[PDB]
Design a protein around this ligand. Structure first.
Ligand code: BCL
Ligand code: BCL
Ligand code: BCL
Ligand code: BCL
Ligand code: BCL
Ligand code: BCL
Ligand SMILES: CC(C)=CCC/C(C)=C\CC/C(C)=C/CC/C(C)=C\CC/C(C)=C/CC/C(C)=C/CC/C(C)=C/CC/C(C)=C/CC1=C(C)C(=O)c2ccccc2C1=O
Ligand SMILES: CCCCCC/C=C\CCCCCCCCCC(=O)O[C@H](COC(=O)CCCCCCCCCCCCCCC)COP(=O)(O)OC[C@@H](O)CO
Ligand SMILES: CCCCCC/C=C\CCCCCCCCCC(=O)O[C@H](COC(=O)CCCCCCCCCCCCCCC)COP(=O)(O)OC[C@@H](O)CO
Ligand SMILES: COC(C)(C)CCC/C(C)=C/C=C/C(C)=C/C=C/C(C)=C/C=C/C=C(C)/C=C/C=C(C)/C=C/C=C(\C)CCCC(C)(C)OC
Ligand SMILES: COC(C)(C)CCC/C(C)=C/C=C/C(C)=C/C=C/C(C)=C/C=C\C=C(C)\C=C\C=C(C)\C=C\C=C(/C)CCCC(C)(C)OC
Ligand SMILES: [Ca+2]
Lengths: 73, 43, 272, 318, 41, 257, 72, 41, 72, 42, 42, 41
């Protein structure tokens, strides 16, 4: 068979505790979420510091008011 | 249930004096800051 | 607040100084004469550290620093802005630490128990006094002690270490490190064993003393015992502190070369 | 003064205790127990018996092969002379491969013996892990001693196998000596800019100091109430007596909060384990992520800034 | 072993499978958006 | 350029934050385990009313110890057995004042002389036998020569007077060691003294007990059966000797300097 | 199915409501602090970007301060 | 297992879902404002 | 959406009011201190910005102090 | 109830709690309007 | 009977265990075919 | 409790206020002298 072979699957919860399993799954998912976000942020795919669509620190350094104040010094 | 053993009359009394004292304290604070602003403005 | 069982133990007496005037509690704390002293000195010391940060360049927590006098002051009295503040704070610190120990003695007397904890605290106090009093006096200047600052007392530690080219070869330093490491190992094993005996495998009874002996005799062949592990603990921690004090009193006063050159007494024995 | 309870004044003997009965199917215990008068002055006097099964024999074969290798190379480094071995013993060592060999297997007298000894020592510690686990579990106890042991093994493997592989060289690992391994410690601090500005190093030092503090405090407190039967902690846990009550009032009055007779052992467990967790975290990031800890600390606003007064001219800029 | 009968286990299983399917659906949607914005392969 | 910076955010930084959060969270769990004994605490209010408070963080849910040899279940945090009947007078009229004993301080059970209310069963070995027993019931023990056998010596009592004579040694079968000395007192009763409150001099053949006075050995609590001791009785005996550390002489509770 | 989630309210017969509420609140506060600190450490920082103007620089170039610094 | 009956669980669930929906609404609003001020993608 | 928050007051049947009040007050004070210190460590700092005037510099250039520094 | 409050007491507490929280948030908004007028940060 | 399962319970568990393991290995094979199509490594 | 009745509290309050007033008077006098000698504002 290939369709009836997963029939008694629902009995899984007669040997595994449902509440413990739920908590374990949730905690593991949160840990993995944090980990994958940190792994992708540490690569060329980083999206906070890529200066797209614009660089904001650089934008602040070249405002006309800041430039005119830095010239007077 | 947490209680303090004060009745409602005792609580009213305490509240009266507490509010008076707090108002006087804040009045003195405001006066100190007006003097400081007159002497050395910070903003 | 009081614990369920606390009221029958809060009796008067047991004090050293003062008497019935300072024998009360404030919340859970017990005050006493030395309680008043300790809080007085702690408050004063903290406020002076903060002021010494205010007259410096920054109030960043990691970069505050109050430094001792120069070596030219000798064992004299330095100006307030160039060392005297450090001296006042280091007087407050001694006052607070000794007050702490004596308050402990009062408490233990009231509860009817032995004076082991203040006695073990005395060795920490002794190490501090070695670093601020004994070593400076033997070398002839207060400016040999460390400054008060996170990150800034670490620069002191580093440069003092490199004044002997390689401080790892200091013998009393090796002995103290041995005691520190063995103490962490022992504490891990003790914690684990008690937890394991009162938290057994699911659906079992709490185990006994025989189980505690058996497990370590099975793994290692020897078990020290439930009362001797507490002794072994007091011993390892006190010895760590003691040999630290010795290693610092040796460096400078009694040895001025590199530390590797001391060890040269061993391969020069005329017996190999 | 009063008796301090540091030495046993009167000793007593009964026949040796063979041990709690093991599950059926187990091997017997080897050895006939002997008694030590000097060990009995401070603790328990019985020595042995010992349990040797499958995992604790494979361990002890691995470990002794490793020890034979290390000892023989130290001895070959002085020309086989045992007199010189005893004379210069703290300066001898077995050295790792030259860093130019990378992660390959080098010839035997240029780093291959180091590699052999490392492999055999590793296997020894993992077999010992399994022994410790099974010994505690066959008597029906919780397996808390295996968790802490696992942490320690992980630190041994980090400095030594994992960090050298992530760097690309076996020559980044410590040698087997006394003064040689101290030299390794100093050099790795010098190369990666001052471990005092590594934050995980600071946190593990916090927890090593704390281990000493906590164990002085606990050892003192239990010796100070042993006149009221405090050294018997299991009974004070499952039926709180006056010893536990006095022990917890002392700390409550002194510093404002307390633990219980069972909880203080969880504080001990954690203070010993966070030390090594921070050890792993601090070594695993050095070299692979951070190249100069002092410059890192300067970038994140941590290092103090002494006044200058002078100007020194970098001669590579001139 | 867990005290659940067979009916309770069937009930739990129904809701567990529904929830897991919904979660995986949301994951797929997040990845389609990310591929449209910043393709990584 | 010696200190050039490429990027402010790195991995060491994030990992340090994660550690700050992993500590800060074992503190939480340990502080919750700390409150399975002695709670809820009693907070005294403005005019004397007492309420039960629980602290921060709150108390955990109860767990069960299953004691061996059908020794029952222990739930913690759970109920408490009732205190006995101590009498105390406060000294100063405020919640944080100290207390004075009302009658004879030695026989009052307050201060260092307080004790707990334990089970009235003996502590057991792994086989089911009583753990602390006299050396005539445990017929396999022997004192190691090289050590002074205390049987026969006298029990000088801290003011120089004689208390009685040692007649038995009480041993611990689970861990072989001495726990109590039994002695016959001045009025011919049999009383125990813990071995951790005795200084034994072999040559003088004396046992010095600095805690109580010589005449005080007549009022030490007694046992029901002399072939075993229960948890309650251990507590009573030890507590009586601990009361003398502050009440034996009227000058002991009176400010050294 | 649209009616797959009907017994969902029974979740609170196996999971404790009060402990879950406390856990959720604490986790949300921790995550708030973390995300604010992660964004403050990047190019998107909004306290130090000197937009809409740099204020320390503005104070250093006031005419009164300039005239006092000249007299020295 | 938690001592709540089925009615109490229904009540708790009602209010829990309402509160979570309101919270997520406020989150969405905060992000729309942030995108208008300083777009990050 | 008009009656979905009706039973909300039954919050206080599972959370102790006094404990919650104390927790809220303490958390608010801690957050107040933290935000003030975070803003004081940035370009928005308002104690050291020398606006509306620099006072140490004002004291260094008083005519009496200048005349005393001259005769030296 | 596990806090000991009845439903009437809970209703009373809730009334005053919500009033107080609203007043507090009002004061916060006022402080921020003043700060924006003095030193705008965005 | 060392685990308390009878022979019928063991047969049942074995059926579902083998089905699950086969499905898992199928998914693994599929992942590797996709990876070979995208980035061949041998 | 502090144990004080209302009469004892009245008595204590009388003397407490008198003492505090005298102390503050002395403080004011010290500051007037210091201002005359070394003005700080
Ligand atoms: C450049 C800034 C100004 C300055 C600006 C301000 C501002 C602004 C304030 C102060 C305030 C205070 N300043 Mg000032 N202050 C300056 C320099 C000083 C110097 C000094 C050595 O240079 C000192 C010692 C002081 C001391 C003081 C305290 C009197 C007062 C804070 C007391 C307190 O914390 O109450 C905590 C104690 C309680 C709440 C106790 C409650 C009741 C108790 C029993 C009675 C307390 C008496 C109280 C201290 C004085 C009240 C007045 C009486 C009628 C005499 N300032 C400089 C010159 N100062 C604060 C103030 O005025 O309070 C109104 C305040 O708002
Ligand atoms: C380049 C630098 C050198 C080096 C240079 C030095 C120098 C220099 C010193 C040491 C000292 C020590 N070194 Mg070394 N050391 C090096 C490498 C190492 C390494 C290693 C793994 O490499 C280790 C493991 C050590 C370990 C040690 C210890 C043996 C010793 C520190 C413990 C101590 O002093 O306790 C003693 C305890 C105290 C001084 C604590 C005082 C406690 C007081 C009384 C209580 C304070 C309470 C507080 C104010 C209250 C706050 C209250 C709040 C409410 C919580 N060093 C390198 C090679 N080392 C120190 C030492 O031995 O001093 C005696 C020392 O001076
Ligand atoms: C280039 C990279 C993309 C990016 C690519 C992805 C991809 C791909 C995914 C995410 C996913 C997530 N991203 Mg993202 N993400 C980016 C930047 C961010 C930033 C940011 C500060 O820049 C943040 C704060 C987030 C945050 C998130 C979380 C919402 C989510 C992780 C959920 C989780 O861990 O649940 C784990 C916890 C549990 C399972 C516990 C139970 C959860 C319960 C059921 C309720 C939780 C609510 C849930 C998170 C959201 C539902 C809201 C809807 C209204 C239903 N991303 C950038 C733009 N992100 C994942 C996701 O969306 O999942 C669907 C995901 O697949
Ligand atoms: C460029 C980046 C933007 C920015 C982008 C965002 C984004 C995006 C978000 C925030 C969010 C928040 N920001 Mg912001 N934020 C910026 C700068 C700041 C500054 C500052 C000093 O610069 C501060 C102090 C804040 C503070 C805050 C909090 C109000 C809020 C996170 C709440 C939380 O942790 O709930 C966790 C705590 C709980 C769940 C406990 C229970 C809460 C109870 C019910 C009461 C709390 C009141 C709640 C915090 C506010 C709603 C009250 C309304 C007045 C009705 N932001 C800059 C300008 N900020 C989040 C938000 O708005 O949440 C809806 C959010 O999604
Ligand atoms: C450039 C930035 C601005 C600045 C921007 C802001 C912003 C924005 C805010 C503050 C807020 C506050 N600022 Mg400010 N603030 C600046 C400079 C200062 C300086 C100083 C020495 O420079 C001080 C001492 C203060 C102090 C304060 C506190 C009054 C207040 C934080 C209250 C709190 O923590 O409650 C926490 C404690 C509790 C909640 C406990 C319960 C409180 C009880 C009910 C009573 C306390 C009353 C409280 C003190 C308010 C008094 C109001 C009365 C009607 C008089 N700011 C500079 C000039 N400040 C906050 C505020 O105003 O809150 C309304 C606020 O949102
Ligand atoms: C060039 C290399 C390829 C790549 C080549 C491969 C190959 C080859 C494989 C994976 C596999 C996996 N890859 Mg990949 N993978 C790449 C990049 C990624 C990235 C990423 C951020 O870049 C992530 C997050 C993943 C993540 C994953 C996991 C989904 C999966 C590992 C499952 C596991 O650990 O079982 C651990 C846990 C269990 C076994 C528990 C048992 C099952 C339980 C009941 C629930 C699990 C659900 C399961 C995770 C998801 C499948 C569900 C379907 C929607 C039906 N890959 C790159 C692009 N990857 C493996 C896989 O797909 O397995 C079939 C696999 O063979
Ligand atoms: C400062 C100020 C503003 C004062 C104003 C307040 C006023 C006016 C007065 C208050 C009165 C007085 C006199 C107060 C003094 C207290 C003050 C202010 C400060 C001191 C607080 C202080 C020093 C705390 C440090 C705490 C730390 C960091 C401890 C380190 C070790 C540590 C983490 C221990 C945790 C584990 C514990 C709890 C161990 C204790 C413990 C041990 C060790 C056992 O062996 C044992 C055995 C059996 C049962 C219980 C125990 C047990 O609880
Ligand atoms: C217990 C631990 C120490 C015991 C060992 C003491 C033995 C030798 C210590 C003397 C070695 C001191 C260092 C000599 C070299 C440095 C120069 C020096 O200072 O040595 C002399 C001082 O000896 C001095 O203090 C001598 C003072 C010694 C007094 C020690 C007694 C301690 C008791 C105090 C307890 C309170 C010469 O002093 P001057 O140059 O006139 O002082 C000038 C500056 O100090 C101040 O302007
Ligand atoms: C025909 C060939 C004859 C072989 C007959 C013997 C069967 C094989 C060994 C039996 C066995 O595998 O038994 C195990 C021994 O493990 C062991 O050797 C473990 C050691 C096996 C490996 C030895 C070399 C180590 C390999 C490298 C390190 C692995 C690291 C893994 C650690 C996590 C367990 O031992 P016990 O539970 O204490 O014994 C109980 C009864 O079985 C006998 O009284
Ligand atoms: C019986 O009757 C009673 C008494 C019970 C009646 C009582 C009923 C009452 C009063 C009920 C009240 C209920 C309340 C107030 C309920 C409030 C419920 C809320 C607000 C629920 C909110 C849930 C929000 C969740 C679960 C959000 C989860 C977010 C997650 C998991 C996101 C994670 C993001 C990640 C992992 C990415 C990180 C991004 C980055 C870049 C930092 O990664 C490193
Ligand atoms: C004369 O003596 C005789 C022969 C008679 C015996 C006497 C033995 C004596 C006296 C020995 C003295 C020994 C001493 C002093 C030893 C000192 C040891 C110290 C202090 C060592 C300190 C640190 C060493 C460490 C941390 C080594 C770590 C190594 C590791 C983790 C190795 C990892 C290698 C692996 C896992 C192998 C990989 C290999 C492979 C094949 C996979 O590569 C591809
Ligand atoms: Ca800005």
């Amino acid at each position: 068979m290939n369709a009836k072979s997963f029939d008694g699957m629902h009995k899984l919860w007669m040997i595994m505790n449902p509440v413990s399993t739920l908590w374990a799954i949730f905690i593991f998912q949160i840990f993995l979420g944090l980990l994958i976000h940190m792994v992708v942020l540490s690569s060329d795919l980083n999206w906070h510091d890529d200066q797209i669509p614009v660089g904001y620190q650089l934008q602040g350094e070249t405002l006309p008011v800041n430039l005119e104040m830095k010239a007077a010094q | 249930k947490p209680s303090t053993g004060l009745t409602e009359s005792e609580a009213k009394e305490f509240h009266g004096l507490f509010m008076a004292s707090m108002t006087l304290w804040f009045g003195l604070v405001v006066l100190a800051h007006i003097l400081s602003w007159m002497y050395r403005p910070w903003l | 607040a009081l614990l369920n069982f606390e009221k029958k133990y809060r009796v008067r007496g047991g004090t050293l100084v003062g008497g019935d005037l300072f024998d009360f509690w404030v919340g859970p704390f017990y005050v006493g004469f030395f309680g008043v002293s300790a809080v007085f000195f702690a408050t004063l010391g903290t406020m002076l550290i903060l002021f010494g940060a205010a007259i410096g360049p920054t109030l960043n927590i990691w970069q505050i620093s109050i430094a001792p006098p120069d070596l030219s002051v000798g064992l004299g009295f330095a100006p307030i802005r160039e060392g005297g503040l450090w001296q006042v704070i280091t007087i407050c610190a001694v006052g607070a630490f000794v007050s702490w120990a004596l308050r402990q003695v009062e408490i233990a007397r009231k509860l009817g128990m032995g004076l082991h904890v203040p006695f073990a605290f005395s060795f920490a106090i002794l190490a501090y006094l070695t670093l601020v009093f004994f070593r400076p006096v033997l070398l002839g200047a207060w400016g040999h002690a460390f400054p008060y600052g996170l990150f800034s007392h670490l620069d002191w530690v580093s440069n003092v270490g490199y004044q002997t080219l390689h401080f790892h070869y200091n013998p009393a330093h090796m002995l103290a490190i041995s005691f520190f490491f063995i103490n962490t190992l022992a504490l891990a094993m003790h914690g684990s064993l008690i937890l394991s005996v009162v938290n057994p495998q699911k659906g079992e009874e709490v185990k006994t003393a025989e189980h505690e002996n058996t497990v370590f005799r099975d793994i290692v062949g020897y078990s020290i015992g439930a009362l001797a592990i507490h002794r072994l603990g007091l011993f390892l921690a006190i010895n760590a502190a003691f040999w630290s004090a010795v290693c610092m009193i040796l460096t400078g006063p009694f040895w001025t070369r590199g530390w590797p050159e001391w060890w040269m007494w061993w391969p020069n024995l005329p017996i190999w | 003064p009063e008796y301090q309870n540091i030495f046993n004044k009167v000793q007593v003997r009964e026949p040796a205790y063979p041990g709690v009965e093991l599950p059926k199917g187990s091997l017997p215990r080897v050895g006939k127990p002997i008694f030590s008068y000097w060990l009995g002055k401070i603790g328990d006097a019985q020595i042995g018996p010992l349990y040797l099964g499958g995992w604790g024999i494979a361990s002890l074969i691995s470990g002794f092969i490793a020890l034979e290798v290390i000892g023989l190379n130290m001895l070959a480094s002085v020309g086989w002379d045992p007199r010189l071995f005893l004379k210069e013993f703290f300066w001898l060592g077995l050295e790792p491969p030259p860093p130019a060999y990378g992660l390959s297997i080098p010839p035997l007298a240029e780093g291959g013996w180091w590699l052999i000894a490392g492999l055999f020592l590793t296997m020894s510690l993992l077999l010992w892990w399994v022994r410790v686990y099974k010994r505690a579990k066959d008597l029906g106890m919780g397996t808390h001693l295996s968790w802490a042991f696992a942490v320690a093994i992980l630190f041994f493997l980090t400095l030594g196998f994992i960090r050298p592989v992530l760097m690309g060289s076996w020559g980044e690992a410590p040698p087997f000596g006394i003064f040689p391994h101290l030299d390794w410690t100093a050099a790795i601090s010098i190369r990666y800019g001052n471990f005092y500005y590594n934050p995980f190093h600071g946190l593990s030092i916090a927890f090593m100091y704390g281990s000493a503090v906590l164990f002085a405090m606990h050892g003192g407190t239990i010796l100070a109430v042993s006149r009221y039967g405090g050294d018997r902690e299991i009974d004070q846990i499952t039926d709180r007596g006056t010893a536990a009550e006095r022990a917890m009032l002392f700390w409550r009055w002194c510093m404002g909060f307390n633990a219980s007779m069972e909880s203080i052992h969880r504080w001990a467990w954690w203070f010993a384990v966070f030390c090594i967790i921070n050890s792993i975290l601090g070594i695993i990031l050095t070299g692979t992520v951070v190249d100069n800890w002092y410059l890192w600390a300067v970038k994140h606003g941590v290092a103090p800034s002494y006044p200058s007064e002078l100007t020194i001219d970098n001669p590579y800029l001139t | 072993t867990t005290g659940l009968t067979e009916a309770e286990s069937k009930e739990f299983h129904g809701i567990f499978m529904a929830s897991m399917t919904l979660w995986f659906g949301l994951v797929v949607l997040a990845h389609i958006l990310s591929w449209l914005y910043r393709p990584w392969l | 350029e010696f200190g050039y910076i490429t990027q402010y955010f790195d991995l060491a930084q994030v990992t340090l934050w994660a550690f700050w959060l992993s500590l800060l969270s074992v503190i939480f769990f340990n502080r919750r385990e700390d409150k399975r004994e002695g709670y809820p605490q009693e907070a005294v209010q403005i005019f004397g009313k007492t309420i039960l408070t629980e602290g921060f963080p709150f108390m955990p849910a109860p767990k069960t110890f299953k004691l061996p040899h059908n020794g029952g279940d222990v739930v913690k945090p759970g109920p408490e057995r009732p205190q006995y009947d101590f009498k105390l007078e406060q000294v100063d009229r405020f919640a944080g004042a100290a207390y004075r004993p009302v009658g004879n301080p030695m026989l009052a059970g307050v201060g260092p002389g307080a004790y707990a209310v334990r089970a009235n069963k003996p502590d057991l070995t792994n086989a089911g036998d009583p753990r602390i027993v006299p050396m005539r019931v445990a017929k396999h023990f022997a004192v190691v020569d090289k050590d002074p056998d205390p049987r026969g010596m006298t029990v000088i009592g801290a003011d120089g007077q004689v208390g009685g004579k040692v007649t038995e040694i009480w041993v611990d079968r689970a861990e072989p060691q001495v726990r109590y000395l039994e002695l016959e007192a001045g009025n011919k009763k049999k009383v125990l003294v813990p071995i951790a409150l005795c200084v034994i001099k072999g040559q003088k053949r004396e046992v010095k007990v600095r805690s109580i006075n010589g005449i005080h050995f007549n009022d030490v609590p007694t046992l029901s059966n002399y072939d075993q001791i229960t948890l309650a009785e251990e507590d009573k005996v030890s507590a009586y000797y601990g009361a003398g550390t502050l009440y034996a002489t009227p000058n002991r509770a009176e400010s050294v300097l």
